[PDB]
Amino acid sequence: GDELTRSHFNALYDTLLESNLCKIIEPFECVEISHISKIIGLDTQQVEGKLSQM
Amino acid sequence: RVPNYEVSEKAFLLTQSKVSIEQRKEAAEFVLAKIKEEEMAPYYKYLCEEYDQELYNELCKKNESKIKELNEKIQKLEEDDEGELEQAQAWINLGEYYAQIGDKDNAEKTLGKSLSKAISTGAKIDVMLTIARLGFFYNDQLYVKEKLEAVNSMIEKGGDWERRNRYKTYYGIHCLAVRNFKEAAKLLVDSLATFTSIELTSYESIATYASVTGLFTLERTDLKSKVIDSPELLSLISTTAALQSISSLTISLYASDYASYFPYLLETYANVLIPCKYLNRHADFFVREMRRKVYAQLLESYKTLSLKSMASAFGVSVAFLDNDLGKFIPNKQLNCVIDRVNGIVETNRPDNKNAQYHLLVKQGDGLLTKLQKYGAAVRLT
Amino acid sequence: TKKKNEEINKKSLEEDDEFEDFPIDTDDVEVDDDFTNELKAELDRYKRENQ
Numbered sequence A: 001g002d003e004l005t006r007s008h009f010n011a012l013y014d015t016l017l018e019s020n021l022c023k024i025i026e027p028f029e030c031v032e033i034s035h036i037s038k039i040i041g042l043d044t045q046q047v048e049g050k051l052s053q054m
Numbered sequence B: 001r002v003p004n005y006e007v008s009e010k011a012f013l014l015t016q017s018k019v020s021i022e023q024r025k026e027a028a029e030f031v032l033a034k035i036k037e038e039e040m041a042p043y044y045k046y047l048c049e050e051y052d053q054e055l056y057n058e059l060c061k062k063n064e065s066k067i068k069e070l071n072e073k074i075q076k077l078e079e080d081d082e083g084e085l086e087q088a089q090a091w092i093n094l095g096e097y098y099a100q101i102g103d104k105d106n107a108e109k110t111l112g113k114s115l116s117k118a119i120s121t122g123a124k125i126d127v128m129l130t131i132a133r134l135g136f137f138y139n140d141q142l143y144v145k146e147k148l149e150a151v152n153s154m155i156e157k158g159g160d161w162e163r164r165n166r167y168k169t170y171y172g173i174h175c176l177a178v179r180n181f182k183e184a185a186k187l188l189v190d191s192l193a194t195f196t197s198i199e200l201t202s203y204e205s206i207a208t209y210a211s212v213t214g215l216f217t218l219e220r221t222d223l224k225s226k227v228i229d230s231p232e233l234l235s236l237i238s239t240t241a242a243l244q245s246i247s248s249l250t251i252s253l254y255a256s257d258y259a260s261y262f263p264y265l266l267e268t269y270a271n272v273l274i275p276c277k278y279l280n281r282h283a284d285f286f287v288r289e290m291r292r293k294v295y296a297q298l299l300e301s302y303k304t305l306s307l308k309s310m311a312s313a314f315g316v317s318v319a320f321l322d323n324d325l326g327k328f329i330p331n332k333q334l335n336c337v338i339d340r341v342n343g344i345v346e347t348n349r350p351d352n353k354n355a356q357y358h359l360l361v362k363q364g365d366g367l368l369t370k371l372q373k374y375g376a377a378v379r380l381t
Numbered sequence C: 001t002k003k004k005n006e007e008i009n010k011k012s013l014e015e016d017d018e019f020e021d022f023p024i025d026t027d028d029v030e031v032d033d034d035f036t037n038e039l040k041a042e043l044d045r046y047k048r049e050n051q
Helices: A003-025 A033-040 A044-053 B002-015 B021-038 B041-050 B053-079 B083-101 B104-116 B121-138 B142-158 B162-177 B182-193 B203-217 B220-228 B231-236 B241-255 B261-273 B283-301 B307-314 B318-331 B353-380 C002-014 C021-025 C033-049
Strands: B304-306 B344-346
Touching: A003 A033, A003 A044, A033 A044, B002 B021, B002 B041, B002 B121, B021 B053, B041 B053, B041 B083, B053 B083, B083 B104, B083 B121, B104 B121, B121 B142, B121 B162, B142 B162, B162 B182, B162 B203, B182 B203, B182 B231, B203 B220, B203 B231, B203 B241, B203 B283, B220 B241, B241 B261, B261 B283, B261 C033, B283 B307, B283 B318, B283 C033, B304 B307, B307 B318, B307 B344
Parallel strands: none
Antiparallel strands: B304 B344
16 A cells, blocks of 8 residues: 555565574584575575575 | 778778778778868878879978968068967967977977967967877877877966866877876766867777777776766667667676676677777787786685586686686686686686785885995996 | 906806807797687586587
């Protein structure tokens, strides 16, 4: 209903996507990628590409 | 104004045998046009070696007309008595008539008087600018350097922001010609925004140059900010093939797409590097740098890859990848070892205090050396 | 005269003209690698595709 809010919410998706991942792997070292994948709730391969970018 | 730079750009094409026959002869027409029109006969002589009697008559005429004209004009401008205004102007004009026909020698003498004889600091800078352009013309770089070293002294003396800009853009081109790209980039990005062209190349040329350097030197984060999100580039889109190719390469480098990176590598070579005069000589050097850089980029994020994965990604065979990695490994930039028995690509990263220790000793040997010799000299004397 | 001493002593190793005897007698290396690569990338592609 708010065209301005909607636009800025795709962006929000993306900067928050980061926020969730960082928190999960912060205590661990040598964490399985399968473990990450379940929590975030996004497919195995998709995650590899994001992480490599980060 | 337009021929002063443009002639050299076309002429360069002609020289080269790299260029396609279609392009070579497209340029040939362009050159011949401007000879007759600007009456370049002295200089034309220089270029012909590197490449009708009516032309010659055109010289002989135009010369004696232009000579007789200016002669008595100048003679009268000196006679009637005030030097601040008339004598100074008259020498400017004299240099300009030499610069049109490209006699270097007689211009050094005339524009030299103008500098010596007291005038506004503005006035000094402006005049020097022409001498530097003739150096760039001649395709001698060291001639440009001596002049522009003086120009730089006067820049903060005068304090015009107008000429700080113009100075930046000349020095920008000089540096594009030498290997050193680091200084070129800094100057080059600012000048996308600002520079009314003066006796130097069009803004389309200047645009492709900022994109090219940006790849080479810039850190990743900073390529994105300054270049992709450039207000200038985005509005300018692509109205040229050269600008299009370089843009396509930038988008895959940042996006970590690798399949399309290699088609794109090939494209920029054809449509950017060879047309551009200054970057032609660095054609080999650039593609080397870029190929190290991409391989590097991917290896930074992976502790390991398998050979099949990496090769399919870039789009080359596994055999083609292996021969190429091993070029760049002893020169140290990719920082990776390769197992053959298990097919694996390990990536060692041992850079730490060790890296920095080697840089300091090597450069150190050199400071010691210089010092010893200057010491000995003076002691004798 | 310190300088003059240098040049004279040196001369016997230089003899007649160790300067002009020799000429009277007689990434920058690597070739155009674009071409090699062009062809490699298409030769890979072909097989990839028809497989």
